[PDB]
Ligand binder design. Structure first.
Ligand SMILES: Nc1ncnc2c1ncn2[C@@H]1O[C@H](COP(=O)(O)OP(=O)(O)OP(=O)(O)O)[C@@H](O)[C@H]1O
Ligand SMILES: Nc1ncnc2c1ncn2[C@@H]1O[C@H](COP(=O)(O)OP(=O)(O)OP(=O)(O)O)[C@@H](O)[C@H]1O
Ligand SMILES: [Zn+2]
Ligand SMILES: [Zn+2]
Lengths: 96, 184, 362, 145, 48
C-alpha cells in the first residue's frame, strides 16, 4: 500500500498540473509544453513567493491586481487560483 | 518586468524581439528574481502577474528541509486530500513555510586520504610495469627473437598479459596496505 | 617482419575477442566438473591428507587435468575481455571526459572535487597526443580551444590540452619533408604514447569486471595449492545465468532495507539483553550438572551473544531456551518478556524481511 | 495401465487420485500458483543446493570436529569426515532444521573457533532458512497476484 | 484484492457520474463543474 501510494503521487504529479489540473497531453501538443507550464506559468513555488511578497508589501503600495488578490485572500476566497483554465487555453487563437 | 510583459503579450512582434535582443543581458541578470503567476482576474479572464522574488527567499526555499516538507505536503494532498480543500491546504502550507523560511533567514545571520593513496598506488605500480619498456633494453630480447617463430610469438603475447595481471595484483595489495595504514 | 607479426597478433586478438563468451561458459562447466569430482573426497589419518578415494581411480588424474584446463581458460577469459570489452570502456570514458571538458569546462573553469578518483585520474589523458584514440570526435581539442581561448587565454588552453603551438605554423611555412620508417626499434619505441597507455591501464585496473575476472583467475591459481578453492567459482552462476538474475533481484532490490532490518533486530535484541541482565539473570543457567553452574548472562557481552544466537534462532524465542519461571516472584514479568520477544522478534521482524522480498518481486 | 496393475497390487489404485488436478477446475487455480513459476522454483532449489555445498566445503575444511553425532563415547559417528556424507548431512538435517545446522551440530562454547562457528551458524540460518524459503513463498504469492 | 476493490470503487465514483456516466473532465471544463453536477444536477439522493 505504501509503495502504491508513492507511485500514485508520482503519476498524478507527472500527468496533471497541480494548480489548474489540466492533463499533460494538452500542453505537450507544443514540445516541452507541460514542463514549461508547470515550471514557469503555474509553478506552485511562484504562488508561494507571491504570497510572501504580497504579505511583506505595504497595503498602500499594492497595485490593482495585488489589491484584488489581497482582499480575496483576506476573505479566504480561492477563486483567483486558475482552475481548469490557463493563458494558453484562453488565448488559443491569438497565441497560436 | 515591463519588457517581459510586452513580450509575453505580443508574441509575434519582430520589432519587439529585436528590442529584446538589445535588452538581452539585463533580462538574463533579472531572470532569477522575476516571478510569474497566472490568476483569474477581476475581468473574468486569466491574467498573468509579475512580481519580485528575493534571493534570501529563494535560498530558504531551496534548503533541503523545506524540500522535505514540500514532498510530505504533496504526498498528503494527493493521497488523502479532496478537491475542495486542495487550495485551502496549499495556502496553509504556504503560510507555514513562509513563516519558517523567514525565521530561518532571521536566525542565519553573520575519503580524500584513501583516494590519494589509491592514486599513488596506481601511479607507482603502473610505473613499475612500464620501466620494463622504458629501459629501451629490448635489444637483448631481440637478439634471441630475431628467429621469431609462432611459438615464441604466442609466448610473448601471453607473457605481456601475465605481467599486466601481476601488476594488477601488486596494485590491489598496495591499496589494501595503504587502507590499513590509513585506518590505523 | 613487422607486417607479419602485427597481422598474426591481430588474428589472435580477434580470435579471443570472438570466443570470449564461449570460454566463460567453458570455465563454468569445468568448475562444475571439478566440484563434482571433489565431492568424492575424504580425509584420512591430526593428519590431514589430500587423498581422493574412488572406485574407478581415474578421477585423480582427471582432477589435475581439469584444474590445469580451468586455469588456462581463466587466463584466456582475461585476454578475451581485454580484446573485446576494454575498447568500449575506453570509448565511453573518453566520450565522458570530452563532453565534460567542452560543455562544462571540467578542467578550465571548474575542477574535480578532489574526492572523485575518476575525475582526478582523467587529468592525465588531456595532455596526451593520442586523445580520442577510440572516441570518434578528433576535433574536441580545437572545440575547447575555440570556446575558452579568449577568456582563459590561448597559451593556457593549449598548455592544458597539450596542444603544441609553434609546430603548426612552422610546418605550414617552409618545412622539410622526409619521413622515417617505423620498422626500427627506436621508431616503434618512440611511437608509443607512454602517458596515454598509463591512463588506459589505470582505467582498466579500476574497471569492475576486469577486477572480477582477476579474482576468478587468482582463485583458479590458488585451487592448485588447495583444490577446495575451486568451489568459489560456483559463485559465478549468478552472472553466468540470466535466469538466476530474476530470483536474486528480489534480494538485491531491497538490500538496504534488509540490512537496516537486521540492524534494528540487533538493537531490539540488545534492549532485551539489557532487561534480562538487569532483572532476569537467575534464569540463564545452562548447565545440567548442578556442581558446575554455566551462567550465560553474568556478562553483558555473553548475554547479548546468547540472545543474538540461541534466542533468535529458536522457534519460540528466548523462553524456549531459558529456565521455566513457574513459582517465582517475577513470573508475570518474565512471561511478558518472553511473549513480547516472540512477537516482536520471531514474528514481526522476520515477516518484515519476507515482505520485503515479496514486495521486490511485485 | 495403472488400473490394470491395481489388480496385481491393490495399492496401485492410489495413483488414480492424482487425477483430481485434471478432474476439478477448482484445483487448477490453486495449482497454477505453483506451476506459474515452476522454472524459478527449480532454480531456487538449485541455488539452495549450491549454497549448502559451499557451507559444506567450509565445514569440511574448518569445522570437522563439531560433527560427531554419537552419544556413546566408545563409538564416534562423524558425519563430516567424508565430503559426500557431510553434504548429505547439510542438505537433509541442516535444511530441515528450524534453526539451521547449529541446532544439530555440537555447541562451540570454549573453542578457538567459537566466533567463526557462530558466524557460520547465523549466516546459514539467515541465508538458507530465512531468505531462500521466503523466496519460494514470495514466488507462490506473486503467482497468485 | 479487497484493498484493490475499495480503490476501484473510489476511483470510479471520483472519475465518472453515477447516473449519466460522463467523465469528470467534461464537467471540469467549468470550475467545480463535476461536483456541481454530481451534487445538484445528478444527485442519486435526489432521485431517491
Ligand atoms: N504546479 C506545479 N508546480 C511544480 N511542479 C508541478 C506542478 N504541477 C505538476 N508538477 C510536476 O512536478 C514536477 C517536479 O517535481 P517536484 O517539484 O515534486 O520535485 P522533484 O522533481 O521530485 O525534485 P526537487 O525536490 O529537486 O525539486 C514537474 O516535473 C511536473 O511534472
Ligand atoms: N450521482 C452521484 N451522486 C452523488 N455522488 C456522486 C455521483 N456520481 C459521482 N459521485 C461522487 O460521489 C462523491 C461523494 O461520495 P459519497 O456520496 O459516496 O460519500 P462520501 O464523500 O464518502 O461521504 P458521506 O457518506 O459523508 O456522504 C462525490 O464527490 C462525487 O465525486
Ligand atoms: Zn497549471
Ligand atoms: Zn450525471
Amino acid at each position: 500500500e505504501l509503495r502504491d501510494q508513492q507511485e500514485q503521487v508520482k503519476e498524478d504529479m507527472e500527468t496533471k498540473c497541480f494548480i489548474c489540473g489540466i492533463g499533460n497531453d494538452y500542453f505537450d501538443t507544443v514540445p516541452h509544453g507541460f514542463e514549461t507550464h508547470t515550471l514557469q506559468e503555474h509553478n506552485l513555488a511562484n504562488y508561494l513567493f507571491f504570497l510572501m511578497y504580497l504579505i511583506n508589501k505595504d497595503e498602500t503600495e499594492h497595485t490593482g491586481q495585488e489589491s484584488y488578490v489581497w482582499k480575496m485572500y483576506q476573505e479566504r476566497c480561492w477563486e483567483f487560483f486558475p482552475a481548469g483554465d490557463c493563458f494558453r487555453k484562453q488565448y488559443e487563437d491569438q497565441l497560436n | 518586468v515591463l519588457l517581459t510583459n510586452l513580450s509575453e503579450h505580443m508574441p509575434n512582434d519582430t520589432r519587439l524581439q529585436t528590442f529584446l535582443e538589445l535588452a538581452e543581458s539585463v533580462l538574463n541578470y533579472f531572470q532569477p528574481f522575476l516571478g510569474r503567476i497566472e490568476i483569474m482576474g477581476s475581468a473574468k479572464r486569466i491574467e498573468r502577474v509579475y512580481f519580485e522574488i528575493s534571493e534570501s527567499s529563494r535560498t530558504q526555499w531551496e534548503k533541503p528541509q523545506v524540500k522535505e516538507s514540500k514532498r510530505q505536503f504533496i504526498f498528503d494532498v494527493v493521497n488523502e486530500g479532496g478537491e475542495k480543500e486542495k487550495m485551502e491546504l496549499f495556502v496553509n502550507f504556504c503560510e507555514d513555510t513562509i513563516f519558517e523560511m523567514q525565521l530561518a533567514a532571521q536566525i542565519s545571520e553573520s575519503s580524500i586520504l584513501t583516494v590519494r593513496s589509491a592514486l599513488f598506488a596506481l601511479r607507482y605500480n603502473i610505473l613499475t610495469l612500464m620501466r620494463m619498456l622504458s629501459l629501451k633494453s629490448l635489444k637483448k630480447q631481440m637478439k634471441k627473437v630475431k628467429k621469431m617463430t609462432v611459438k615464441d610469438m604466442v609466448t610473448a603475447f601471453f607473457s605481456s598479459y601475465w605481467s599486466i595481471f601481476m601488476t594488477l595484483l601488486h596494485f590491489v595489495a598496495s591499496v589494501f596496505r595503504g587502507f590499513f595504514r590509513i585506518i590505523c | 617482419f613487422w607486417k607479419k607479426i602485427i597481422a598474426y597478433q591481430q588474428k589472435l586478438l580477434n580470435y579471443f575477442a570472438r570466443n570470449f563468451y564461449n570460454m566463460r561458459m567453458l570455465a563454468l562447466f569445468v568448475a562444475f566438473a571439478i566440484n563434482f569430482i571433489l565431492l568424492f573426497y575424504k580425509v584420512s589419518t591430526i593428519a590431514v591428507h589430500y587423498v581422493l578415494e574412488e572406485s574407478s581411480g581415474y578421477m585423480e588424474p582427471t582432477l589435475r587435468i581439469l584444474a590445469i584446463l580451468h586455469t588456462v581458460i581463466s587466463f584466456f577469459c582475461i585476454i578475451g575481455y581485454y580484446c573485446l570489452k576494454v575498447p568500449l570502456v575506453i570509448f565511453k570514458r573518453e566520450k565522458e571526459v570530452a563532453r565534460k571538458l567542452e560543455f562544462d569546462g571540467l578542467y578550465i573553469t571548474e575542477q574535480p572535487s578532489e574526492d572523485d578518483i575518476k575525475g582526478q585520474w582523467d587529468r592525465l589523458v588531456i595532455n596526451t597526443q593520442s586523445f580520442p584514440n577510440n572516441y570518434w570526435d578528433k576535433f574536441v581539442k580545437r572545440k575547447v580551444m575555440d570556446k575558452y581561448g579568449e577568456f582563459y587565454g590561448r597559451d593556457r588552453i593549449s598548455e592544458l590540452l597539450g596542444m603544441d603551438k609553434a609546430a603548426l605554423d612552422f610546418s605550414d611555412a617552409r618545412e622539410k619533408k622526409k619521413p622515417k620508417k617505423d620498422s626500427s626499434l627506436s621508431a616503434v619505441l618512440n611511437s608509443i604514447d607512454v602517458k596515454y597507455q598509463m591512463w588506459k591501464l589505470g582505467v582498466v585496473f579500476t574497471d569492475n569486471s576486469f577486477l572480477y575476472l582477476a579474482w576468478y583467475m587468482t582463485m583458479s591459481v590458488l585451487g592448485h595449492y588447495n583444490n577446495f578453492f575451486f568451489a568459489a567459482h560456483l559463485l559465478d552462476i549468478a552472472m553466468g545465468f540470466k535466469t538466476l538474475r530474476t530470483i536474486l533481484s528480489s534480494v538485491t532490490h531491497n538490500g538496504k532495507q534488509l540490512v537496516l532490518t537486521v540492524g534494528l533486530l540487533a538493537v531490539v535484541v540488545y534492549l532485551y539483553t539489557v532487561v534480562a541482565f538487569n532483572f532476569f539473570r537467575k534464569f540463564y543457567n545452562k548447565s545440567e550438572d548442578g556442581d558446575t553452574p554455566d551462567m550465560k548472562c553474568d556478562d553483558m557481552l555473553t548475554c547479548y551473544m546468547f540472545h543474538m544466537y540461541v534466542g533468535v534462532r529458536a522457534g519460540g524465542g528466548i523462553g524456549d531456551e531459558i529456565e521455566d519461571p513457574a513459582g517465582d516472584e517475577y513470573e508475570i514479568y518474565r512471561i511478558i518478556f518472553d511473549i513480547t520477544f516472540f512477537f516482536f522478534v520471531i514474528v514481526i521482524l522476520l515477516a518484515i524481511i519476507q515482505g520485503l522480498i515479496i514486495d521486490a518481486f511485485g
